[PDB]
Structure 1
Amino acid sequence: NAKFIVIEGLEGAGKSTAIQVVVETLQQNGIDHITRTREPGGTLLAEKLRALVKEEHPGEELQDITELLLVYAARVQLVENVIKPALARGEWVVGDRHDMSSQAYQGGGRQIAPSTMQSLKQTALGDFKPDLTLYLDIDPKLGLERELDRIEKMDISFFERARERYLELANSDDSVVMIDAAQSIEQVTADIRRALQDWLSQVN
């Protein structure tokens, strides 16, 4: 049965090579219909919104609530127009970021009230969630070391708050598996392959 697998983590955790290993592992397990997505983005409108979030806004203060609304608008478009239909056709979906990123960056980083984050999540997504999330955990500075956009230019305390939120969620959500991304690409890759293989072997 079709599943939604998400790859998560701070800047430079290694989500790009992780997606590679996840797709390859799925293929090795006989899954031959897979759709990758990335957030924010993945549709014409969502990509326009991604640009609005990543670009600088000279002469205009981009309010925290506005940022949240934009990433959610992009997510709704992707979920309704790409992800759900793909799952419905029987394709597995592998996402480069999903809602956990809003929780970490907008909730932890921007410090938006938890009541606000949950009511917006409910409004946008209902109970829709990934089946497995592979959270690549990394010290923010180390990840940054690996033309910065508006968010990447935030001070490190923002990313520390984001990491704190990611870790809380990884610890409370049984569907989140944490990977130590501070290792060599080879070891991280090996741990991802194992965690996913281990998880696939327990479905049903």
Structure 2
Amino acid sequence: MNAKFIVIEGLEGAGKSTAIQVVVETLQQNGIDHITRTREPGGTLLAEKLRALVKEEHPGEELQDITELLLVYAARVQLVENVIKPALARGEWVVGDRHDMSSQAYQGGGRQIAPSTMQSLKQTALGDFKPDLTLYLDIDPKLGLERARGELDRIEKMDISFFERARERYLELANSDDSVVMIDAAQSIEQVTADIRRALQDWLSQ
């Protein structure tokens, strides 16, 4: 095995942090002890500042959808170039909390930004770079918002249909991509854990 980038995806409330930890422990049980964890938007000083700009409301100013996409991308470029690519080049595996699949679902599906725009901006910012394995934790939008309880950011204040379109695109990508495996996240902790731990052990042996 050589180093890989594994991404956890899904709506908020899908138990992403449980999944991250499951993924990490699996790799450890498999003799992989050098692992880097990341989150997006974020993971660098500047990326974290961009995350805060994206999650806040701006007074006397409408945050345009394209702006939103440009910002998540600017944060993505920083992470990929300063943290992710160098870790992989050194033989360190990277486990991330969201990556580009989130822009496709949130900005593509949710904001309804033209797919052609999505495609060319992904091209300019990332070229060909892509995760090696993504675990998309799928959950019903209302169930998910009601598990995220315990303050709603600018995106989390959007109406339900927004999350439904995000979900639909997440589903279109998950079925059309063999490097994406779907996990039913509305099960109990023992079971989400079993399916993640089983889809990854599985994937590794391949």
TM-score between both structures, scaled by the size of structure 2: 0.97
After TM superposition, give the deviation of residue 174 of structure 1 in Å.
0.7
After TM superposition, give the deviation of residue 195 of structure 1 in Å.
0.5
Aligned length: 201
**For residue 45 of structure 1, what is the aligned residue in structure 2?**
46
Match of 1:177 among 172, 181, 192: 181
* Cα distance in 1 between the residues matched to 2:46 and 2:194: 36
After TM superposition, give the deviation of residue 11 of structure 1 in Å.
1.0
* Cα distance in 2 between the residues matched to 1:191 and 1:181: 9
Match of 1:156 among 156, 160, 164: 160
Q: What 5-or-longer segments of structure 2 have no aligned partner? A: none
* Cα distance in 1 between the residues matched to 2:162 and 2:108: 10
Cα offsets for 1:160-188 (capped at 9, x unmatched) = 00000000000111100000001011211
After TM superposition, give the deviation of residue 58 of structure 1 in Å.
2.2
After TM superposition, give the deviation of residue 86 of structure 1 in Å.
0.3
Cα offsets for 1:39-60 (capped at 9, x unmatched) = 0000000000000000111221
Task: Say which SS state the counterpart of residue 95 (structure 1) adopts.
Answer: strand
After TM superposition, give the deviation of residue 108 of structure 1 in Å.
0.2
Cα offsets for 1:34-90 (capped at 9, x unmatched) = 000000000000000000000111221000000000000000000000000000010
Task: Say which SS state the counterpart of residue 93 (structure 1) adopts.
Answer: strand
* Cα distance in 1 between the residues matched to 2:59 and 2:139: 31
* Cα distance in 1 between the residues matched to 2:128 and 2:178: 16
* Cα distance in 2 between the residues matched to 1:16 and 1:32: 19
Cα offsets for 1:78-132 (capped at 9, x unmatched) = 0000000000010000000000000000000000000000000000001100000
After TM superposition, give the deviation of residue 16 of structure 1 in Å.
0.7
Task: Say which SS state the counterpart of residue 36 (structure 1) adopts.
Answer: strand
**For residue 75 of structure 1, what is the aligned residue in structure 2?**
76
* Cα distance in 2 between the residues matched to 1:115 and 1:95: 26
* Cα distance in 1 between the residues matched to 2:200 and 2:183: 11
* Cα distance in 1 between the residues matched to 2:118 and 2:13: 25
RMSD: 0.5
**Greater mean deviation of Cα atoms: 73-82 or 54-63:** 54-63
The 4+ residue runs of structure 1 with deviation greater than 6 A are none
Q: Percent identity?
A: 100
